[PDB]
């Protein structure tokens, strides 16, 4: 199907196939040297150069080496600089270049490569779709939105562009507008639309506007393998971990941490109140679009397992206390933070990103009425000096209808069934 040989390369097809057979047989090192000799002898052959790049690519996989992959990325580029490169080969080479640049985190490099692909193949819709993903991966949602708008103006029923356009609209809090794009896109069944992110946000968008069909999409996301259950919808998971909305201290095994929080709760409270009174700018407004209404801010001491040194200058005794518990200070998928919430606040039903953490709440200033938290089908209240523990990968929701402020201390711990190996290896969130 793919024509990769130009006029000259057809005349050396026997040497090219001999080298490629070595690669497909798994003799990566012999294949590299074979293609290297072909590149030496035929420096202008695009197929020889692509063979070298693919062998370097395979070798980087065998050796798990970023440096070898950086070589391959350069050789895929060399292919594109040679004369008389067939169009199928040019596209294959730069597509892989971009994909491998993304694998290494060279999102700026991938973007330049994707922009070149679109310039070279201005009628290939899938490449424009890939360019939009390049922008999403660097956080440039404004340019990503423009790309999918251009795609949909030409091919209005492209499902990949629909689900990605809907994702962007929802991230901008255009909730009602996002629903038909996410739904139509998923329903298209096009490649790339059967993705847990789109079921997740479609159901959540529907929940926010009061569309009772939301749980039909959660139900179908569950049946298609994206969600462990309809209630537990996190997407960065280790399968097999015990799944319960609410946990006791003894069930977690972290009984010493809980005792320390409960015995020393007043020093934790007083440092939080001192920050409220003398350094309130350390409390930052919630910024993940999780409120329907109201005021909610957090003062973070640890995130991704890293201590915030300036923040700890505002709660030095609390930071000193917590240092004895690596189950939380080293939880690279959680945080340690104060959270203040004021009356008139409603936090939308939502889910955290990962099932690899459990979340402890210590009550610090709790009005006697008006504050409550639901996780799954059970609602609870806080108590001053007491710890609640829940799995925030389950859907949960919060209300604050008191007549004064509510302050809690939030401490994330690794899920207790994670091994030390997993705790060291999982990527941070």
């Amino acid at each position: 199907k793919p024509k990769l040989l130009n006029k000259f390369d057809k005349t050396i097809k026997a040497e090219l196939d001999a080298a490629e057979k070595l690669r497909k047989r798994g003799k990566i090192e012999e294949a590299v040297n074979a293609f290297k000799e072909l590149v030496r002898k035929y420096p202008q052959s695009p197929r020889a150069r692509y063979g070298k790049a693919q062998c370097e690519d395979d070798l980087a996989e065998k050796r798990r080496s970023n440096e070898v992959l950086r070589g391959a990325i350069e050789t895929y580029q060399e292919v594109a600089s040679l004369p008389d490169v067939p169009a199928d080969l040019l596209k294959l080479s730069l597509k892989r270049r971009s994909d491998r640049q993304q694998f290494l985190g060279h999102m700026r490099g991938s973007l330049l490569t994707l922009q070149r692909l679109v310039q070279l193949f201005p009628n290939d819709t899938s490449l424009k779709n890939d360019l939009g993903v390049g922008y999403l991966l660097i956080g440039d949602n404004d340019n990503a939105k423009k790309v999918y708008e251009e795609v949909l103006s030409v091919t209005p029923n492209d499902g990949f562009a629909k689900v990605h356009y809907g994702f962007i609209l929802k991230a901008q809090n255009k909730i009602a507008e996002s629903i038909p794009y996410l739904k139509e896109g998923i329903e298209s069944g096009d490649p790339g639309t059967d993705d847990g992110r789109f079921y997740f946000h479609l159901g959540d968008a529907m929940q926010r506007v009061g569309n009772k069909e939301a749980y039909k999409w959660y139900e179908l996301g569950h049946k298609r393998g994206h969600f462990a259950s309809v209630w537990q919808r996190s997407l960065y998971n280790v399968n097999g971990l015990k799944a319960q909305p609410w946990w006791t201290p003894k069930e977690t095994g972290y009984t010493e941490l809980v005792k320390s929080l409960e015995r020393n709760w007043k020093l934790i409270r007083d440092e939080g109140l001192a920050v409220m009174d003398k350094a309130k700018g350390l409390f930052l407004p919630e910024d993940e679009n999780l409120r329907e209404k109201g005021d909610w801010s957090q003062f973070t001491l640890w995130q991704q397992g890293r201590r915030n040194e300036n923040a700890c200058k505002g709660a030095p005794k609390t930071c000193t206390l917590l240092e004895k518990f690596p189950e939380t200070t080293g939880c690279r998928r959680g945080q340690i933070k104060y959270s203040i919430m004021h009356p008139g606040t409603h936090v939308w039903p939502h889910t955290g990103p990962t099932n690899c953490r459990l979340r402890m709440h210590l009550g610090l200033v709790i009005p006697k009425e008006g504050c409550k938290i639901r996780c799954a089908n059970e609602t609870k209240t806080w108590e001053e000096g007491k710890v609640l523990i829940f799995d925030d990968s389950f859907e949960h929701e919060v209300w604050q209808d008191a007549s004064s402020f509510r302050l809690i201390f939030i401490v994330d711990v690794w899920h207790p069934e994670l091994t030390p190996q997993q705790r060291r290896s999982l990527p941070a969130i």
Partner: peptide
Amino acid sequence: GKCKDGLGEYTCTSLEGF
């Protein structure tokens, strides 16, 4: 852009190669 309490980003983990 980090996923702290929710799942709002296109991707929540970093890409750092092998």
